[PDB]
Design a protein around this motif. Structure first.
Motif, PDB file in Angstrom:
ATOM      1  N   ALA A   5       0.760  -1.247   0.000  1.00 53.88           N
ATOM      2  CA  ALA A   5       0.000   0.000   0.000  1.00 53.88           C
ATOM      3  C   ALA A   5       0.796   1.306   0.000  1.00 53.88           C
ATOM      4  CB  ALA A   5      -0.969  -0.007   1.159  1.00 53.88           C
ATOM      5  N   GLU A   6       1.873   1.330   0.772  1.00 52.19           N
ATOM      6  CA  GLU A   6       2.699   2.513   0.956  1.00 52.19           C
ATOM      7  C   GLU A   6       3.370   3.249  -0.185  1.00 52.19           C
ATOM      8  OE1 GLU A   6       5.481   1.891   4.135  1.00 52.19           O
ATOM      9  OE2 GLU A   6       3.874   1.573   5.599  1.00 52.19           O
ATOM     10  N   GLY A   7       4.113   2.534  -1.020  1.00 50.93           N
ATOM     11  CA  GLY A   7       4.837   3.205  -2.086  1.00 50.93           C
ATOM     12  C   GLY A   7       6.060   3.765  -1.375  1.00 50.93           C
ATOM     13  N   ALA A   8       6.650   4.836  -1.894  1.00 51.78           N
ATOM     14  CA  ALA A   8       7.828   5.433  -1.268  1.00 51.78           C
ATOM     15  C   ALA A   8       8.872   4.361  -0.943  1.00 51.78           C
ATOM     16  CB  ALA A   8       7.421   6.208  -0.004  1.00 51.78           C
ATOM     17  N   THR A   9       9.162   3.540  -1.941  1.00 47.48           N
ATOM     18  CA  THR A   9      10.107   2.441  -1.834  1.00 47.48           C
ATOM     19  C   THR A   9      11.554   2.868  -1.653  1.00 47.48           C
ATOM     20  OG1 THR A   9       8.699   1.302  -3.438  1.00 47.48           O
ATOM     21  CG2 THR A   9      10.739   0.277  -2.840  1.00 47.48           C
ATOM     22  N   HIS A  10      11.879   4.042  -2.174  1.00 52.31           N
ATOM     23  CA  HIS A  10      13.238   4.564  -2.118  1.00 52.31           C
ATOM     24  C   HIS A  10      13.301   5.936  -1.449  1.00 52.31           C
ATOM     25  CE1 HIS A  10      14.674   1.816  -5.570  1.00 52.31           C
ATOM     26  NE2 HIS A  10      13.408   1.521  -5.347  1.00 52.31           N
ATOM     27  N   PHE A  15       0.034   5.000   0.082  1.00 53.95           N
ATOM     28  CA  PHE A  15      -0.510   5.134   1.438  1.00 53.95           C
ATOM     29  C   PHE A  15       0.346   6.061   2.308  1.00 53.95           C
ATOM     30  CE2 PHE A  15      -1.508   3.129   5.727  1.00 53.95           C
ATOM     31  CZ  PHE A  15      -2.880   3.358   5.732  1.00 53.95           C
ATOM     32  N   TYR A  16       1.623   6.145   1.959  1.00 53.28           N
ATOM     33  CA  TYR A  16       2.583   6.967   2.654  1.00 53.28           C
ATOM     34  C   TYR A  16       2.079   8.404   2.697  1.00 53.28           C
ATOM     35  CZ  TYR A  16       7.297   8.171   4.273  1.00 53.28           C
ATOM     36  OH  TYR A  16       8.367   8.545   5.071  1.00 53.28           O
ATOM     37  N   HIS A  17       1.362   8.808   1.656  1.00 55.24           N
ATOM     38  CA  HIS A  17       0.854  10.156   1.576  1.00 55.24           C
ATOM     39  C   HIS A  17      -0.665  10.195   1.704  1.00 55.24           C
ATOM     40  CE1 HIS A  17       4.652  10.374  -1.055  1.00 55.24           C
ATOM     41  NE2 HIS A  17       4.920  11.196  -0.060  1.00 55.24           N
ATOM     42  N   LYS A  18      -1.340   9.201   1.146  1.00 52.00           N
ATOM     43  CA  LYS A  18      -2.789   9.196   1.161  1.00 52.00           C
ATOM     44  C   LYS A  18      -3.494   8.698   2.416  1.00 52.00           C
ATOM     45  CE  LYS A  18      -3.266  11.121  -2.888  1.00 52.00           C
ATOM     46  NZ  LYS A  18      -1.826  11.317  -3.231  1.00 52.00           N
ATOM     47  N   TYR A  19      -2.745   8.251   3.422  1.00 52.07           N
ATOM     48  CA  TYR A  19      -3.409   7.727   4.616  1.00 52.07           C
ATOM     49  C   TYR A  19      -4.531   8.558   5.227  1.00 52.07           C
ATOM     50  CZ  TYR A  19      -0.074  10.368   7.457  1.00 52.07           C
ATOM     51  OH  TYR A  19       0.679  11.388   8.017  1.00 52.07           O
ATOM     52  N   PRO A  20      -4.407   9.892   5.243  1.00 50.66           N
ATOM     53  CA  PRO A  20      -5.489  10.690   5.830  1.00 50.66           C
ATOM     54  C   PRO A  20      -6.799  10.560   5.050  1.00 50.66           C
ATOM     55  CG  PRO A  20      -3.456  11.903   5.775  1.00 50.66           C
ATOM     56  CD  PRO A  20      -3.297  10.771   4.830  1.00 50.66           C
ATOM     57  N   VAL A  21      -6.695  10.433   3.725  1.00 54.58           N
ATOM     58  CA  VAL A  21      -7.864  10.289   2.852  1.00 54.58           C
ATOM     59  C   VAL A  21      -8.486   8.921   3.122  1.00 54.58           C
ATOM     60  CG1 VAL A  21      -8.698  10.236   0.487  1.00 54.58           C
ATOM     61  CG2 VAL A  21      -6.735  11.656   1.047  1.00 54.58           C
ATOM     62  N   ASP A  22      -7.641   7.895   3.234  1.00 53.33           N
ATOM     63  CA  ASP A  22      -8.138   6.541   3.506  1.00 53.33           C
ATOM     64  C   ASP A  22      -8.789   6.396   4.873  1.00 53.33           C
ATOM     65  OD1 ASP A  22      -7.333   5.467   1.037  1.00 53.33           O
ATOM     66  OD2 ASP A  22      -5.311   5.272   1.767  1.00 53.33           O
ATOM     67  N   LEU A  23      -8.236   7.071   5.874  1.00 52.77           N
ATOM     68  CA  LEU A  23      -8.776   7.004   7.230  1.00 52.77           C
ATOM     69  C   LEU A  23     -10.041   7.832   7.376  1.00 52.77           C
ATOM     70  CD1 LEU A  23      -5.402   6.850   9.008  1.00 52.77           C
ATOM     71  CD2 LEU A  23      -7.192   5.094   8.940  1.00 52.77           C
ATOM     72  N   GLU A  24     -10.155   8.849   6.530  1.00 49.62           N
ATOM     73  CA  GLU A  24     -11.327   9.708   6.518  1.00 49.62           C
ATOM     74  C   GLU A  24     -12.478   8.879   5.960  1.00 49.62           C
ATOM     75  OE1 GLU A  24     -11.698  13.007   3.893  1.00 49.62           O
ATOM     76  OE2 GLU A  24     -13.362  13.585   5.226  1.00 49.62           O
ATOM     77  N   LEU A  25     -12.204   8.229   4.833  1.00 48.72           N
ATOM     78  CA  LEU A  25     -13.159   7.358   4.156  1.00 48.72           C
ATOM     79  C   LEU A  25     -13.483   6.128   5.003  1.00 48.72           C
ATOM     80  CD1 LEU A  25     -11.497   7.640   0.676  1.00 48.72           C
ATOM     81  CD2 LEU A  25     -13.954   8.018   1.061  1.00 48.72           C
ATOM     82  N   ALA A  26     -12.491   5.612   5.727  1.00 44.58           N
ATOM     83  CA  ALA A  26     -12.733   4.447   6.567  1.00 44.58           C
ATOM     84  C   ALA A  26     -13.788   4.819   7.620  1.00 44.58           C
ATOM     85  CB  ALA A  26     -11.428   3.976   7.236  1.00 44.58           C
ATOM     86  N   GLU A  27     -13.580   5.938   8.312  1.00 44.28           N
ATOM     87  CA  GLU A  27     -14.520   6.402   9.337  1.00 44.28           C
ATOM     88  C   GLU A  27     -15.909   6.688   8.784  1.00 44.28           C
ATOM     89  OE1 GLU A  27     -13.655  10.152  11.259  1.00 44.28           O
ATOM     90  OE2 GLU A  27     -15.014   9.647  12.905  1.00 44.28           O
ATOM     91  N   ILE A  86     -11.691  -7.141   6.156  1.00 41.67           N
ATOM     92  CA  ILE A  86     -11.719  -7.440   4.735  1.00 41.67           C
ATOM     93  C   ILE A  86     -10.419  -7.061   4.043  1.00 41.67           C
ATOM     94  CG2 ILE A  86     -12.695  -5.211   3.975  1.00 41.67           C
ATOM     95  CD1 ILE A  86     -14.169  -6.640   1.825  1.00 41.67           C
ATOM     96  N   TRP A  87      -9.890  -7.974   3.235  1.00 45.99           N
ATOM     97  CA  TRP A  87      -8.695  -7.664   2.451  1.00 45.99           C
ATOM     98  C   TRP A  87      -9.323  -7.213   1.127  1.00 45.99           C
ATOM     99  CZ3 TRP A  87      -3.684  -6.888   3.118  1.00 45.99           C
ATOM    100  CH2 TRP A  87      -2.905  -6.724   1.964  1.00 45.99           C
ATOM    101  N   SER A  88      -9.126  -5.967   0.700  1.00 49.86           N
ATOM    102  CA  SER A  88      -8.357  -4.943   1.399  1.00 49.86           C
ATOM    103  C   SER A  88      -9.249  -3.719   1.591  1.00 49.86           C
ATOM    104  CB  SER A  88      -7.111  -4.565   0.577  1.00 49.86           C
ATOM    105  OG  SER A  88      -7.399  -4.458  -0.804  1.00 49.86           O
ATOM    106  N   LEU A  89      -8.753  -2.692   2.282  1.00 50.28           N
ATOM    107  CA  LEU A  89      -9.527  -1.464   2.506  1.00 50.28           C
ATOM    108  C   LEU A  89      -9.689  -0.726   1.178  1.00 50.28           C
ATOM    109  CD1 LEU A  89     -10.990   0.286   4.473  1.00 50.28           C
ATOM    110  CD2 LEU A  89      -8.885   1.436   5.018  1.00 50.28           C
ATOM    111  N   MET A  90      -8.578  -0.422   0.533  1.00 53.36           N
ATOM    112  CA  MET A  90      -8.620   0.232  -0.757  1.00 53.36           C
ATOM    113  C   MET A  90      -7.865  -0.720  -1.690  1.00 53.36           C
ATOM    114  SD  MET A  90      -5.907   1.080   1.057  1.00 53.36           S
ATOM    115  CE  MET A  90      -4.332   1.726   1.114  1.00 53.36           C
ATOM    116  N   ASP A  91      -7.915  -0.496  -2.997  1.00 51.71           N
ATOM    117  CA  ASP A  91      -7.184  -1.392  -3.894  1.00 51.71           C
ATOM    118  C   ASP A  91      -5.695  -1.211  -3.652  1.00 51.71           C
ATOM    119  OD1 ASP A  91      -9.518  -2.277  -5.165  1.00 51.71           O
ATOM    120  OD2 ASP A  91      -9.356  -0.685  -6.684  1.00 51.71           O
ATOM    121  N   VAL A  92      -4.990  -2.323  -3.481  1.00 53.89           N
ATOM    122  CA  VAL A  92      -3.550  -2.293  -3.255  1.00 53.89           C
ATOM    123  C   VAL A  92      -2.836  -3.113  -4.335  1.00 53.89           C
ATOM    124  CG1 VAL A  92      -3.748  -1.920  -0.757  1.00 53.89           C
ATOM    125  CG2 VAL A  92      -3.661  -4.276  -1.652  1.00 53.89           C
TER     126      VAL A  92
END
Length: 454
Positions: free
Chosen positions: A20-25, A52-64, A406-412
Motif C-alpha cells: 500500500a505505501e509506495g515510497a520504496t526509495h 498510502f505513505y501520503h494518502k493515509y489521511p484520505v483513507d482514514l477519513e473514508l474508513a470512518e 476485509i482484504w483490502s480497505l482500498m485497492d492495493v
C-alpha cells in the motif's frame, strides 16, 4: 432468519506496508527482496502502489465515513532499521507515529503487524529466517517497536508464516525461489514460530498493557473423497505442511505425535532433516499460553487426493502426500464458506486455549469494472456476505470471534498480479491516486451500523 453480529464486533479493513505505501526509495527506507525481483521480472513495481505513505489521511477519513472501526497496518521493518538492525531511521519512526495518530483521530483502531513478507534485503539475502542470527534481529526490532509505539494496543508478530515457507521454498515463486525443499519449509516454519514465541514472551515480561497475537493463513484441507482413507490421509499430511505444524508450535509448545510422525514421513519421502534445539522448545513452551488472540486469514479451501508420484507444482502434487484436485460439483477460485466454519471449530477443539479469534483477511479479488465512478461489485458483496454468515453461525455455536477484516480497505498492489487483481472496498485510480467507494463500501457501511447481514 436474518443473521446478526455482536454489537462490539469490529468491521475492519486490511492493508500491508509494501503493498500500500509506495515510497520504496524515499525517507531512508531500506530495500526488500521484492525490489530487485519485481524490477527485472515484471512491467510493474511497488511504486506508487496505493501511495498510502501520503494518502493515509484520505483513507482514514473514508474508513470512518463508511463504518470501518478497525484497520490492519503493518510497520515496514526496512523503514525503521534500513539494514535490518543497528541505525534507527527517524523519518520511518515519525511516519508511523503520524499514521497511528490519524487512526485514533478517526476512531479506527489500529491492529499492527511487525512483519508482512518484507524482511530487509540485507538479512533476507543472508538466509532470512533459516539463519538463526536473524531471529535475534527480529526480536530486537519487535522490542524497539513495543517501546517506541505505546499508542498501539493490538500487536501481531507475523502475517502468514505458512505462505512464506510455501512461496520461498516449496513452490519457489517468491525469492530465493527455491523449489520443492520440504526441510526448508518446515525449518522456516519452526524458526519463525520461535521468533514469535520469544517476542510474545518479551512483550509480556516487559509488562506492556496491550494485546499480542499471531496471524496465520489457514486454508481448510479436505479429502477429495471423504470415504476414501488414502484421501483422508493425503489431506491430513497436507494440513500438517500448511496448518498443523504451525498451530502446534503456537498452542502446544511442541509438535504432537501426529505432526512429528507426518513430518517424518514427508521428509523420509522427500529428503532433509530438521534442526530442532532444546532452547527452541523452551521458548515455544513459555509462550503457548501468552497469545491474546489468533488471526485467521482465509480465502478458500483445498481438496486432496491420494496419488503417488514425483513432486510437481506449477498443478500441485507432493511425493508421499498427494495431489490437489477440485471437487466436480462445488461452486466456482472455488467458493467454500463452510471451510471457514470448519477451520474455526478445528482451532476451538484442538487448541481450547485459543481465547479469541479475529478473521484478519478474507476477500474476493478480480478485475473490477469501473463505471459511473464506482464499481458495481455484487460478486464481492456476495462472497463477503456468505463468509460473514458462517461467522455468525460459528459464534452462535460457541466460538469466540470478535472481528472481521476485509482484504483490502482500498485497492492495493499484488506481487503476482500487479495492479490488475483488485480487492478493495475503495477503488484506487492508480494514476491519480484518487479513491472511489465501490458498491461494497456502501454495503459494508450499512452492515457496520446495523450488524445485520442482509
Amino acid at each position: 432468519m436474518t443473521k446478526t453480529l455482536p454489537k462490539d464486533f469490529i468491521f475492519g479493513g486490511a492493508t500491508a506496508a509494501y503493498q500500500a505505501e509506495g515510497a520504496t526509495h524515499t525517507d531512508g527506507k531500506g530495500p526488500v527482496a521484492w525490489d530487485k525481483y519485481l524490477e527485472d521480472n515484471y512491467w510493474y513495481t511497488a511504486e506508487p502502489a496505493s501511495d498510502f505513505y501520503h494518502k493515509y489521511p484520505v483513507d482514514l477519513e473514508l474508513a470512518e465515513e463508511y463504518g470501518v472501526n478497525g484497520i490492519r497496518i503493518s510497520i515496514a521493518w526496512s523503514r525503521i532499521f534500513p539494514t535490518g538492525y543497528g541505525e534507527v531511521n527517524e523519518k520511518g519512526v515519525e511516519f508511523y507515529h503520524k499514521l497511528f495518530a490519524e487512526c485514533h483521530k478517526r476512531h479506527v483502531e489500529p491492529f499492527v503487524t511487525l512483519h508482512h513478507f518484507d524482511t530487509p534485503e540485507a538479512l533476507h539475502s543472508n538466509g532470512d529466517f533459516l539463519n538463526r542470527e536473524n531471529i535475534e534481529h527480529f526480536i530486537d526490532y519487535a522490542a524497539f517497536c513495543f517501546e517506541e509505539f505505546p499508542e498501539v494496543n493490538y500487536w501481531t508478530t507475523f502475517n502468514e508464516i505458512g505462505p512464506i515457507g510455501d512461496g520461498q521454498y516449496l513452490v519457489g515463486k517468491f525469492p530465493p525461489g527455491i523449489k520443492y525443499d520440504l526441510a526448508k519449509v518446515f525449518q522456516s516454519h519452526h524458526n519463525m514460530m520461535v521468533s514469535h514465541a520469544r517476542a510474545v514472551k518479551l512483550y509480556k515480561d516487559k509488562g506492556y498493557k496491550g494485546e499480542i497475537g499471531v496471524v496465520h493463513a489457514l486454508p481448510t484441507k479436505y479429502p477429495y473423497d471423504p470415504e476414501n482413507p488414502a484421501d483422508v490421509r493425503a489431506a491430513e499430511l497436507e494440513d500438517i505442511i500448511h496448518n498443523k505444524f504451525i498451530l502446534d508450535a503456537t498452542y502446544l509448545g511442541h509438535y504432537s505425535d501426529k505432526t512429528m510422525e507426518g513430518v517424518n514421513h514427508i521428509l523420509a519421502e522427500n529428503g532433509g532433516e530438521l534442526d530442532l534445539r532444546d532452547e527452541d522448545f523452551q521458548a515455544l513452551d513459555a509462550a503457548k499460553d501468552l497469545n491474546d488472540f489468533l488471526g485467521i486469514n482465509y480465502y478458500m479451501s483445498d481438496w486432496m487426493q491420494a496419488f503417488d508420484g514425483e513432486t510437481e507444482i506449477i498443478k500441485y502434487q507432493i511425493k508421499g502426500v498427494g495431489r490437489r484436485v477440485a471437487p466436480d460439483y462445488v461452486p466456482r477460485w472455488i467458493i467454500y464458506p463452510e471451510g471457514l466454519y470448519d477451520q474455526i471449530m478445528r482451532v476451538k477443539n484442538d487448541y481450547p486455549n485459543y481465547k479469541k479469534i479475529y478473521i484478519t483477511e478474507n476477500g474476493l479479488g478480480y478485475k473490477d469494472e469501473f463505471v459511473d465512478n464506482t464499481v458495481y461489485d455484487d460478486g464481492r458483496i456476495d462472497y463477503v456476505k456468505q463468509h460473514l454468515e458462517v461467522l455468525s453461525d460459528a459464534i452462535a455455536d460457541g466460538a469466540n470471534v470478535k472481528g472481521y477484516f476485509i482484504w483490502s480497505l482500498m485497492d492495493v498492489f499484488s506481487w503476482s498480479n500487479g495492479y490488475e487483481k483488485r480487492y478493495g472496498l475503495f477503488y484506487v485510480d492508480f494514476d491519480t491516486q484518487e479513491r472511489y467507494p465501490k458498491k461494497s463500501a456502501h454495503w459494508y457501511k450499512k452492515l457496520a451500523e446495523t450488524q445485520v447481514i442482509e
